[PDB]
Amino acid sequence: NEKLILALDQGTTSSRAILFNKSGEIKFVSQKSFEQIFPTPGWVEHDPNEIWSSQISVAAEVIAKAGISGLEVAAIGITNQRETTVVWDRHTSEPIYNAIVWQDRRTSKYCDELKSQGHTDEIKQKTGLVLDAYFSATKLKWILDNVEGAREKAEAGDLCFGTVDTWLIWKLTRGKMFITDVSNASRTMMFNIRTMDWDDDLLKLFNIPRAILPEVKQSSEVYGETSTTSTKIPIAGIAGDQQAALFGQMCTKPGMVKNTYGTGCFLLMNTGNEAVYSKNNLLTTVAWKINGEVSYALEGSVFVGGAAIQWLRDGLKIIHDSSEVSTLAETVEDNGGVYFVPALTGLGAPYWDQYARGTIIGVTRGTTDGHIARATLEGIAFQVYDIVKAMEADAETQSTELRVDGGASASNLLMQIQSDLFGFKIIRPKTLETTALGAAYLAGLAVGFWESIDEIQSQWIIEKEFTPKEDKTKIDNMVSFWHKAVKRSQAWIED
Amino acid sequence: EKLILALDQGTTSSRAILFNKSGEIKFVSQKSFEQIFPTPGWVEHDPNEIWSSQISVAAEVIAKAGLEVAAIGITNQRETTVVWDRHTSEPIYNAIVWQDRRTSKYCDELKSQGHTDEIKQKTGLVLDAYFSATKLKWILDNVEGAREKAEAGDLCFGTVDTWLIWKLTRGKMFITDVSNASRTMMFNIRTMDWDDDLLKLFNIPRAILPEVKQSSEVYGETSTTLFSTKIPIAGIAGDQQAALFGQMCTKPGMVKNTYGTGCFLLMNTGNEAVYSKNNLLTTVAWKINGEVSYALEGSVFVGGAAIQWLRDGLKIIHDSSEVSTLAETVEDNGGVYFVPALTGLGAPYWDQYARGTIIGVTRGTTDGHIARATLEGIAFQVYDIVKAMEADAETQSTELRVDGGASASNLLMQIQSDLFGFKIIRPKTLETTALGAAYLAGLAVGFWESIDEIQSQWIIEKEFTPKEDKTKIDNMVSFWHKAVKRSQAWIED
Amino acid sequence: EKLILALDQGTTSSRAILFNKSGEIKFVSQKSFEQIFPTPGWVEHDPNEIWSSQISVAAEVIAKAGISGLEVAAIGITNQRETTVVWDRHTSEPIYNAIVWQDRRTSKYCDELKSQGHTDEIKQKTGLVLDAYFSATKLKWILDNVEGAREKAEAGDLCFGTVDTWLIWKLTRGKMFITDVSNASRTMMFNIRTMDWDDDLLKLFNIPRAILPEVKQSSEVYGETSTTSTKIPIAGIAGDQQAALFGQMCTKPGMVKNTYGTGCFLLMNTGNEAVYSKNNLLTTVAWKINGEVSYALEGSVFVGGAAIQWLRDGLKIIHDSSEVSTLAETVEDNGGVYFVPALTGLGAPYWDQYARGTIIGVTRGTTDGHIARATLEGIAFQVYDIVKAMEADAETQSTELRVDGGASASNLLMQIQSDLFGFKIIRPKTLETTALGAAYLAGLAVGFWESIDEIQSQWIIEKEFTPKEDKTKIDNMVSFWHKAVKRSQAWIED
Amino acid sequence: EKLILALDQGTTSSRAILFNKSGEIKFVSQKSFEQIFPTPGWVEHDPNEIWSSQISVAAEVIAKAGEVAAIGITNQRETTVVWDRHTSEPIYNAIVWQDRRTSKYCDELKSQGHTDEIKQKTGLVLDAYFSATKLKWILDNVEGAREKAEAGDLCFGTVDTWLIWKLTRGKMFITDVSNASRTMMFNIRTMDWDDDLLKLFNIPRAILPEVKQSSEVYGETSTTLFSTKIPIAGIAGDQQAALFGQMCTKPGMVKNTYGTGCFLLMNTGNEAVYSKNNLLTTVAWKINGEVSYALEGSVFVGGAAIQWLRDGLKIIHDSSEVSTLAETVEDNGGVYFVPALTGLGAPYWDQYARGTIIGVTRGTTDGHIARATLEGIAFQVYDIVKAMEADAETQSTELRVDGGASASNLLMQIQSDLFGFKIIRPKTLETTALGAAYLAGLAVGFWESIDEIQSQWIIEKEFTPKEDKTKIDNMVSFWHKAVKRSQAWIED
Numbered sequence A: 001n002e003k004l005i006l007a008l009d010q011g012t013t014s015s016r017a018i019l020f021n022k023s024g025e026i027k028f029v030s031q032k033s034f035e036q037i038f039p040t041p042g043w044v045e046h047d048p049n050e051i052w053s054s055q056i057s058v059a060a061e062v063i064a065k066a067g068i069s070g071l072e073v074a075a076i077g078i079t080n081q082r083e084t085t086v087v088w089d090r091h092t093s094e095p096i097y098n099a100i101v102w103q104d105r106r107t108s109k110y111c112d113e114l115k116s117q118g119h120t121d122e123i124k125q126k127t128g129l130v131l132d133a134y135f136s137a138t139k140l141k142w143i144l145d146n147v148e149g150a151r152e153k154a155e156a157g158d159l160c161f162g163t164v165d166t167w168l169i170w171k172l173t174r175g176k177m178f179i180t181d182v183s184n185a186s187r188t189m190m191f192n193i194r195t196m197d198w199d200d201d202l203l204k205l206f207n208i209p210r211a212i213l214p215e216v217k218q219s220s221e222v223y224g225e226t227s228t229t230s231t232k233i234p235i236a237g238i239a240g241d242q243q244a245a246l247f248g249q250m251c252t253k254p255g256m257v258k259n260t261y262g263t264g265c266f267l268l269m270n271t272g273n274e275a276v277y278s279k280n281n282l283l284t285t286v287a288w289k290i291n292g293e294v295s296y297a298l299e300g301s302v303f304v305g306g307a308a309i310q311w312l313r314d315g316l317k318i319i320h321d322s323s324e325v326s327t328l329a330e331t332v333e334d335n336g337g338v339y340f341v342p343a344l345t346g347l348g349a350p351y352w353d354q355y356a357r358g359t360i361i362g363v364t365r366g367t368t369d370g371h372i373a374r375a376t377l378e379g380i381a382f383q384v385y386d387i388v389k390a391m392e393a394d395a396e397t398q399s400t401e402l403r404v405d406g407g408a409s410a411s412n413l414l415m416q417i418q419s420d421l422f423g424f425k426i427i428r429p430k431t432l433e434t435t436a437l438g439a440a441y442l443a444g445l446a447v448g449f450w451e452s453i454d455e456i457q458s459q460w461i462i463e464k465e466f467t468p469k470e471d472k473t474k475i476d477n478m479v480s481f482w483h484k485a486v487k488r489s490q491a492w493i494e495d
Numbered sequence B: 001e002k003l004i005l006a007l008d009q010g011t012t013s014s015r016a017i018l019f020n021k022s023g024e025i026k027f028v029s030q031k032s033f034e035q036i037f038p039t040p041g042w043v044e045h046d047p048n049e050i051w052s053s054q055i056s057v058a059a060e061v062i063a064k065a066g067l068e069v070a071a072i073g074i075t076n077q078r079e080t081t082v083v084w085d086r087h088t089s090e091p092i093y094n095a096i097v098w099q100d101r102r103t104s105k106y107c108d109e110l111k112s113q114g115h116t117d118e119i120k121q122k123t124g125l126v127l128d129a130y131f132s133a134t135k136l137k138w139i140l141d142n143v144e145g146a147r148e149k150a151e152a153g154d155l156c157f158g159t160v161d162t163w164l165i166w167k168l169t170r171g172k173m174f175i176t177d178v179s180n181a182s183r184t185m186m187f188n189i190r191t192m193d194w195d196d197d198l199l200k201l202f203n204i205p206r207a208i209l210p211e212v213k214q215s216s217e218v219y220g221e222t223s224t225t226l227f228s229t230k231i232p233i234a235g236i237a238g239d240q241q242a243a244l245f246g247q248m249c250t251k252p253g254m255v256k257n258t259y260g261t262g263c264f265l266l267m268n269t270g271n272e273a274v275y276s277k278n279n280l281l282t283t284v285a286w287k288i289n290g291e292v293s294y295a296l297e298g299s300v301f302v303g304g305a306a307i308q309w310l311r312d313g314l315k316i317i318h319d320s321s322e323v324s325t326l327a328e329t330v331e332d333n334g335g336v337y338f339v340p341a342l343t344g345l346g347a348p349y350w351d352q353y354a355r356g357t358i359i360g361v362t363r364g365t366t367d368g369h370i371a372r373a374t375l376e377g378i379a380f381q382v383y384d385i386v387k388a389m390e391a392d393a394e395t396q397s398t399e400l401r402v403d404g405g406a407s408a409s410n411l412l413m414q415i416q417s418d419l420f421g422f423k424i425i426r427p428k429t430l431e432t433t434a435l436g437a438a439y440l441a442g443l444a445v446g447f448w449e450s451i452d453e454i455q456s457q458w459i460i461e462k463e464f465t466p467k468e469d470k471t472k473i474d475n476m477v478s479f480w481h482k483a484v485k486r487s488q489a490w491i492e493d
Numbered sequence C: 001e002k003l004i005l006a007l008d009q010g011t012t013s014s015r016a017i018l019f020n021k022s023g024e025i026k027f028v029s030q031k032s033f034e035q036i037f038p039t040p041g042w043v044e045h046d047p048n049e050i051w052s053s054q055i056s057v058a059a060e061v062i063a064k065a066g067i068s069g070l071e072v073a074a075i076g077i078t079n080q081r082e083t084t085v086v087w088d089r090h091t092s093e094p095i096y097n098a099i100v101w102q103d104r105r106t107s108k109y110c111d112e113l114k115s116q117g118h119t120d121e122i123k124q125k126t127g128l129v130l131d132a133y134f135s136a137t138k139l140k141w142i143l144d145n146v147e148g149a150r151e152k153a154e155a156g157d158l159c160f161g162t163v164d165t166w167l168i169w170k171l172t173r174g175k176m177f178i179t180d181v182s183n184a185s186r187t188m189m190f191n192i193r194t195m196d197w198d199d200d201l202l203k204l205f206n207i208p209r210a211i212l213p214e215v216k217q218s219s220e221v222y223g224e225t226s227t228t229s230t231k232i233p234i235a236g237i238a239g240d241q242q243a244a245l246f247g248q249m250c251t252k253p254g255m256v257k258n259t260y261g262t263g264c265f266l267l268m269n270t271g272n273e274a275v276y277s278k279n280n281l282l283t284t285v286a287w288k289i290n291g292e293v294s295y296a297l298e299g300s301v302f303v304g305g306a307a308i309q310w311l312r313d314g315l316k317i318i319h320d321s322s323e324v325s326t327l328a329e330t331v332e333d334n335g336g337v338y339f340v341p342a343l344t345g346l347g348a349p350y351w352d353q354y355a356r357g358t359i360i361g362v363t364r365g366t367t368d369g370h371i372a373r374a375t376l377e378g379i380a381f382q383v384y385d386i387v388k389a390m391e392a393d394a395e396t397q398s399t400e401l402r403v404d405g406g407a408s409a410s411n412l413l414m415q416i417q418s419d420l421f422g423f424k425i426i427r428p429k430t431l432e433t434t435a436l437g438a439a440y441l442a443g444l445a446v447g448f449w450e451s452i453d454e455i456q457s458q459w460i461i462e463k464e465f466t467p468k469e470d471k472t473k474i475d476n477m478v479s480f481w482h483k484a485v486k487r488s489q490a491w492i493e494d
Numbered sequence D: 001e002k003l004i005l006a007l008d009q010g011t012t013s014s015r016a017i018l019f020n021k022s023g024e025i026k027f028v029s030q031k032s033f034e035q036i037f038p039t040p041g042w043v044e045h046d047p048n049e050i051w052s053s054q055i056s057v058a059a060e061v062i063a064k065a066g067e068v069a070a071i072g073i074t075n076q077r078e079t080t081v082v083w084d085r086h087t088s089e090p091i092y093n094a095i096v097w098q099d100r101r102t103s104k105y106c107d108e109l110k111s112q113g114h115t116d117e118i119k120q121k122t123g124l125v126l127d128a129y130f131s132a133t134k135l136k137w138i139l140d141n142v143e144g145a146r147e148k149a150e151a152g153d154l155c156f157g158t159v160d161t162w163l164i165w166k167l168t169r170g171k172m173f174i175t176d177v178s179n180a181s182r183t184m185m186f187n188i189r190t191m192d193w194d195d196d197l198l199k200l201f202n203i204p205r206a207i208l209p210e211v212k213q214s215s216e217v218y219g220e221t222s223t224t225l226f227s228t229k230i231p232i233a234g235i236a237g238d239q240q241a242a243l244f245g246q247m248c249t250k251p252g253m254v255k256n257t258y259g260t261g262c263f264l265l266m267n268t269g270n271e272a273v274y275s276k277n278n279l280l281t282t283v284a285w286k287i288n289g290e291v292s293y294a295l296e297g298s299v300f301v302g303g304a305a306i307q308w309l310r311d312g313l314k315i316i317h318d319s320s321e322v323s324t325l326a327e328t329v330e331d332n333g334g335v336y337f338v339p340a341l342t343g344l345g346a347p348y349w350d351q352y353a354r355g356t357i358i359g360v361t362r363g364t365t366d367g368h369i370a371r372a373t374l375e376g377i378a379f380q381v382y383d384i385v386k387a388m389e390a391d392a393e394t395q396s397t398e399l400r401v402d403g404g405a406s407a408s409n410l411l412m413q414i415q416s417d418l419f420g421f422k423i424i425r426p427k428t429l430e431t432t433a434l435g436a437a438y439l440a441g442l443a444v445g446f447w448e449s450i451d452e453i454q455s456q457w458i459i460e461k462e463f464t465p466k467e468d469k470t471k472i473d474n475m476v477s478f479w480h481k482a483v484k485r486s487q488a489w490i491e492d
């Protein structure tokens, strides 16, 4: 009979569960959104209990939807929004605070303190990361320093830290497995990517007790079975979502690159077994560990990509569904002079301005909602443009193509705009959910669903190519006004 | 704190509710699923989406609460018919919903051949497309190979309770309760067993039918899932019978009306099956501690679903709750009547060919009047089955207990009270369908020690008393009945 | 450039259109006014807002044209028919709202007159049927129900008028109190055989003769405007549907047009002969020009484009009238839904004063798309029934139909109509043939144009719709339409 | 009873209002007309639609009234119309006051040292706001225009002159002192067209109208189909008309109008006062042979930003919904909206600033956007009041307000909170039209004195401030931060 691989993809915006077959084809998908909590502008939080309820309910749903039961599932693969920090009671499994999301800006001033104290080069060398509110360590420190009774419980060994993967695996195993993988660990700013170990010097700097940390495991390995209560399904793959997308795009050789258009926008290049330090404001990170071999990546991180479309839908309410942004944008011929820097949670690479905020500029009396949707799409593509120009310099290579994926990559208009900005081709494959696909791959190799990586190479199938159709001079004048708008967005928040 | 899980698989959404021992709702999850209309008059559900929607809200509500579930009670949209391969659990056709009208002409054939009274005497039911038997026969007649498979015992028939329990136990339990079984038109409510005369009439092989059980007893436990532990399954009842039990209507003469997808008025008649003389149904309420209780029922096909049509179809409201605000933009119905026969007419009309009819429209008619007429149309339909039941019982009621999602509309309840000429009692918990399933399961595992323990949990939240002149009410009822006749005998095929 | 000014006082909006010598619309202004419903079934207009809306669009279109009133060669007047205005001869103040042709309040009295044997009499004298549609019972209602009206009327202190007469009264500050033969024929007080007010009918409705305007030809220089002001010659008057017949060049016996406006109105030119209908149509006066009277056969549908305005204003499922076509195209067919738009009862061939708007066939899958599509079909089905009645009367099978009016702009409605008939629909370049015809009447009177022959070449086909064959579907739709119509009938009782 | 007809030709719509002797509105009609944007930054009106919309509303109110003792004319200022003298056909669209196309040429004149001369002669600053560069653009860019202008075959007019031209079928070619002062071709010290400025802008004197008093029987309208000949007896630029309508006829008296833009005017008596804080010196009116002057702060986009929410962004469907939508949130949520949709007027005078929304986060709603629009209106008025207080060396304790957008109670409370003093809103918000009526009525003796009409000014509501001055100072600080982020945006 038929066997399937289950990928759980716990995203910033929704949790997904997808069933793949041996051909890498999606057979069934369930998806469920969960609340984006903003206690004050600049802060972003998730209910850790709704992360779990949304993720496990769509897991039950997709199996049921498939007409099958857990008996037909070969293995579970876990991938997740990265950096986001959960802290719970080791004995009751209750979160002691909400999850603080990677987008949250509240630790910006402390990160600036750490820069002024001289820690930038030490942090970069050990972790590949920059001193930004983006990563987990300062969020963990915030919870231990601010939640009533948290510091004393952590020093007694009664607390657990996790990125979302660890939280989900904890809940899936009734607390019997407290683990993370190297790729998720590398995003915490507590994990030395050169020694591939939690860094006691960094733990000392952040005043974090080592006992609160999970065990770091490789990205593809039978770690154990589920036991929420219950069905015994092997959990065999873990990876941060953007690394899993890289794995899902077959970018397993040095120099291969993809960009994901999801809640944010993330460009990752595989750098083999060498940690490459950026000269152009990008991150050094761990790609995965498989068969005992570590692979590294360079990364450009854009905080708000598709989330700017979600803002048009839920905040501004000028569209009813995400898919209408392209239709609305096409009611106008161009951006009409409007530029939208979507720094709704600050600016990531290459700017790293924790204090920039969302900025729409150039509005006149004839500006319409169509111009706003079109400038939203351009602002997404402008941000990816900037991290690609950073990565090309780090690589000292001019690109001729770019593989793309993620939910916002479904917009043909967005991909054409992006192609036009780049002056080279955009390549969109048949399966846009490469994040979940990569996790399925990682788990499937570990249990033997697939015999080797060569077996799954022929599954990467191009669906549509976009080629540039615009004058390089006019593109450079749009780019010029984009960079001018970005500066207008910066150094806005003072507190 | 131990809890009891109620699964309420409705016509338009699946729910999972956790109750504590005080009868309070502690956690609730709900998820809609697709209403499939292959041609006007047909109504289908995907059985795998009935299942996926029901199991995902069960997983979600358990997860929300953070092993501590004492038992599960199962309750469901009745009559809706599911047929599946016994070895694969693959449905061989969509579920054919109770509202579906495709078997109307075959029912009329059986009427003309003289099977109407035999069916009434055996099953308590009116020969109508409403019930399961003709839907199962359609599937066996029209699905390639299904007939030979059913004859060999390789297929299963179930109402939705049976389908849910099949999937919950990975095909280890193939059961229904007496209340659901009584809605199939294959179950004799006097012998309390499947009827061989009716099975031969509809050409249904007995091998395809589940075992009929009590409404409250530990049947077994759920099969191993990802989201929970093995949980006892300990209650089953058709949703409207569960609502009657949830309303504490355990004594002869007690009545409730549910305002849900449709509208359903049931009176408990004790150990006595009471045959209607006024176009109502005689049905099984439940079986508990070995004792069978019966009911008289008035069945309205489209009640809250007409509000859903204003939202999804006409799109003059964005959410169900907005129907009352919109109706309150006008002072009265403006001359407009809406017979919501969107799936034909149920009791007391039993017109399979009636269709939705809006009449009396003028140039000043607004969307406010349409909303008002929608609510009045729900209330007028309930009016007609109450008058029928008052005739059967030879009583003039002085009050009526109500529940259900659409009973949240204070305006709809005021309209209803004005039409009735007596009081309407709305309790604190409107989800009496799920509550009743919880009660049946909880009594069975001892979560509650006796029905005397749960009495105190019925709490009155608001009473509505009539306001309008009787002669004005009489005029409106007269035009309503005039509109009903304009709706009738519309479809010919 | 010399221009001709047409004033088209419609049921829904007042319009002013300036035409050149080529018959081309050069400028147009339009303004809606309030539709007043004191109780369901009643329909009233504020006569002062008819005036203020009409005089303000006249001013606006002249200013819009970069010209002044001096450049205007003449004014032609056309109007919603039957609608009844009564005002004080001395103060020009109306004594009551205008009672609109759609109004049903006089239905029971019409039935009274029927049961007293007056049906054959009314038809012989006027060509009309006993129905709340026509002016006489509305005027009688006002004299009988307005405090002091009956005394003022017998004293000669009141004026009656259809809307042409009201506008001309205001335009001349009471110096001209006139109507034309076509408007007059709609009052049920004007004998179309003698071509004069009928004293027997006046006795029956208890209407004093002194309250009636003088009936004039449809094309002749009556006098000048004089609101205070500038003298422009008023030189043409016609009821709007007869103006549309004249605007469609339907000046020879047997020529036909249907207008898709607030209602739907099918008129055939019958020349010098008043043909009496055997299929529930009206016999009416088309016009009188150069001393020559032309008659027509008419089929009258009360609610056509008004059903679209009801989707916009009442149901609010469209924002603009033109969106009805787009919404209707979101579905492939009516989905089983039928909409009998009897919002003001049923006109020809049913003449049911008590029928009311009816939507039937709704199921759980029915959408606003189907409602839009059923609305367009209901317009087309009602035109289908009067065309079939006119073919029987004429003993002729049509092979084409010239169409016009605001709702004829809908390509989907015209295709549906062509599909139902199985023959082509011809839409001309100017949809405002009501206004065009009124302009023709005034232009011929002042010599702006020399003759009918001269204007013939101005009628230019914009688009032809040819029928798409779907015989089984169409027969089934028409059958359920007739079934639906019966479900709408005999609804109101009081 | 006789009535006065005020014709208020606004930037957004044309209105006609009939007032009785008590100053109450007896009839009012309003009709919008098209805002044409050939390219972002440009703003044009169809002069034929200005005319038709104004006639339509006039004919409608005259129809309802049916006794018009006189007509007062008031209008959007600066907006420039050029037409053929013999055919009355305009040779180009009207170039509206908001239009920015002449910005680079104004900067060219600044570089060539003409700022002080322009300010001393006209009270104005070199900005695309004013008529002169718009007239020059039309004469330069429309084929054959310059030949016709030198031969005296063309007419120039602000909107008052265009309306009177059409109302009299070309028999009267006039403007008043207040409208003329806004052209940058009229010397407000000599009170006459300035030959030196005309030479500078290459404008022939033969295309200008005759400048008249603001209250005087100039003549009568021509006979129309809808009315007899009516005396035309008052003309003033709309914002000066509002100053008159607010009874601000004594030195030091101030009002602010919240209309399409926002305009703060103080009467300075018979003395032209030159600003030291980026305001304009302008002619208030001339009545009974006496010229009155004013200081003015000009905000280009006030209520027009609400119209942009309605027509552009479409998050409201009627202008009045802005307050309700803004009340769905408790504060601006960190969002600031600089409504520089046509550049920035006083005190910034940045022709190249454009509309800027800043501070957006993921939880920002359309509610916050509505609230930031109202605050942005109030912030701009805050800035011109602060500049005016510096010129006048006086701390205000109150401010009289009027205009279509002042009907928003929320907007007025925000403004009061920011100011820290009270806002006085009178019963009739149409003080522009009221002032036109007053000017016309005085001229024909409908009212026999200024003192007679004084009692017609009735306070309808007073708003008192209710917020902490430091929390306001921080909002104001961020507002000023946002303004700078909007500036020097356009390069061409």
Ligand SMILES: Nc1ncnc2c1ncn2[C@@H]1O[C@H](COP(=O)(O)OP(=O)(O)O)[C@@H](O)[C@H]1O
Binding pocket: C010, C011, C012, C013, C240, C260, C261, C262, C263, C304, C305, C306, C307, C308, C309, C321, C322, C323, C324, C325, C405, C406, C407, C408, C409, C410, C434
């Ligand atoms: N694009 C359109 N499509 C369909 N109907 C339309 C359209 N535009 C206007 N209408 C309809 O036109 C009707 C008015 O047509 P018109 O000829 O002006 O009326 P009247 O017969 O009163 O003179 C209205 O009832 C309106 O619903």
Ligand SMILES: Nc1ncnc2c1ncn2[C@@H]1O[C@H](COP(=O)(O)OP(=O)(O)O)[C@@H](O)[C@H]1O
Binding pocket: D010, D011, D012, D013, D238, D258, D259, D260, D261, D302, D303, D304, D305, D306, D307, D319, D320, D322, D403, D404, D405, D406, D407, D408, D432
């Ligand atoms: N209720 C309201 N609340 C807020 N703004 C309003 C309201 N009604 C109209 N407006 C605004 O009023 C402005 C027009 O005011 P008005 O005095 O008529 O204009 P103008 O100053 O151009 O003559 C428009 O920009 C519109 O957005």
Ligand SMILES: [Mg+2]
Binding pocket: A010, A011, A012, A013, A014, A015, A263
């Ligand atoms: Mg997500």
Ligand SMILES: [Mg+2]
Binding pocket: B009, B010, B011, B012, B013, B014, B261
């Ligand atoms: Mg339901």
Ligand SMILES: [Mg+2]
Binding pocket: C009, C010, C011, C012, C013, C014, C262
């Ligand atoms: Mg009309």
Ligand SMILES: [Mg+2]
Binding pocket: D010, D011, D012, D013, D014, D260
């Ligand atoms: Mg305006």
